[PDB]
Design a protein around this ligand. Sequence first.
Ligand code: HEM
Ligand SMILES: O=C(N[C@@H](Cn1cncn1)c1ccc(Cl)cc1Cl)c1ccc(-c2nnc(-c3ccccc3)o2)cc1
Length: 448
Amino acid sequence: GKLPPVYPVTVPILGHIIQFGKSPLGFMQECKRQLKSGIFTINIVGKRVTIVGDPHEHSRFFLPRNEVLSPREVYSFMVPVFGEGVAYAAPYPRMREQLNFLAEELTIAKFQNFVPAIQHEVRKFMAANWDKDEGEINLLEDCSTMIINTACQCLFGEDLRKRLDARRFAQLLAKMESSLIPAAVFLPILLKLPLPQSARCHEARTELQKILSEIIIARKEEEVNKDSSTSDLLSGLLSAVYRDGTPMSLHEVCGMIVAAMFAGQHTSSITTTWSMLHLMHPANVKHLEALRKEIEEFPAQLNYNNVMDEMPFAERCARESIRRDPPLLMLMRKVMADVKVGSYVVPKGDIIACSPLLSHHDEEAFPEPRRWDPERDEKVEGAFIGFGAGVHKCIGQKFGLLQVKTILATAFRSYDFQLLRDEVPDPDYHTMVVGPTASQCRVKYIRR
Ligand code: HEM
Ligand SMILES: O=C(N[C@@H](Cn1cncn1)c1ccc(Cl)cc1Cl)c1ccc(-c2nnc(-c3ccccc3)o2)cc1
């Protein structure tokens, strides 16, 4: 009656999923062009997915309440990692309380200490691995390693870090990441079947929870004497009290730690990696010299004020990396009730989606979208959705960018880099969180 245009189904069981796999951006643009409409419906394994692909209409996706546009069903596949009743799996008011508590642990007030702590970890890394006059590295692997160290330095007590060090924490997160199946969104039977991948999620989460409980017990054994107990993400969340007067359970605390550490790890690593890749490319020398000018007068020891107040260009670099190659390609909700978007009604039962990948390549909002240009601004309000928006906007943005900017400032003060390829790497769309193709990320570092 008032449905968006349906892109024709020509291969029935998997309507558009194979073409989407082959070229996510190419596919979606072709739907947009052929149907002459930013708002269109594709068919994924038999499920209607209505894409809100017109930037002018972003608010119709991001602003409706959970009860109308629901995130629970689309995050169901992450329950084995977050836990039953945690985050999106909890009743919505309780979901928001949990997410709010997490947000409060990532506030700007803590950054006074985070900045030197982060730089210290970075400098430790570089000293140990970038210690030659010049050397070849995988930049993606190395940025990932730095982000695990910097994040854990900020958010984990030293006792926790001893128990769960960078190597072990990486392995744990990797076991989780490699064992999740986003396809379960469209093949919900997967969540009910015996799968090795589900078992592995349970093992990893159980290992983490065991470690947390041992740390909690040890702190309680030792605290009365200390006069100075450990303050970290774990202790913060443990002291949270819900509006009904009850504390978070360890189960919930573990899940929220999984959520934070998982969320921050890949996105922040990938963002740092893309930024450095672009900045070291010849097409972008004007931009590199803009970064080197920004940071030229900084102390050897970055402080809060340097990073928070005096790095607007470095931040523009991070943001435009996410603009061009957003780590999260597709944001989704389940439609619980009919919703107006543009000239259309999206029916109850649809999955509705808003794709940072598609929207970031709308040529009205972002002319020449495959050009990386940190000096661009959007020409359509709210077109940039790299960190989402509205009800579920990213709560980790500032902390993520804090780490990115600190690495950029620290790396480029002491090194140049040469990309060992003519072009900036292709994005690799095969993974949950999309980064540059790992095998294309070998670079030469050169000490200054
Ligand atoms: C570093 C680059 C980052 C990018 C590009 C990014 C991107 C996003 C996006 C697109 C969303 C929206 C999800 C949706 O609409 O369904 C989101 C939400 C979220 N992000 Fe991030 N994020 C980043 C860093 C972080 C970090 C460092 C953390 C935690 C330390 C974090 C934690 C979260 C959480 C908890 C949510 C859910 C918010 C809610 O549901 O209300 N993110 N992020
Ligand atoms: O990593 C995921 N979610 C993360 C996103 N994140 C927020 N900041 C940093 N990352 C996440 C979100 C909320 C919370 Cl609290 C914890 C996490 Cl850790 C995630 C990745 C991919 C998908 C996904 N599901 N379906 C797709 C998809 C569907 C069609 C085409 C392409 C992708 O992608 C879902 C979740």
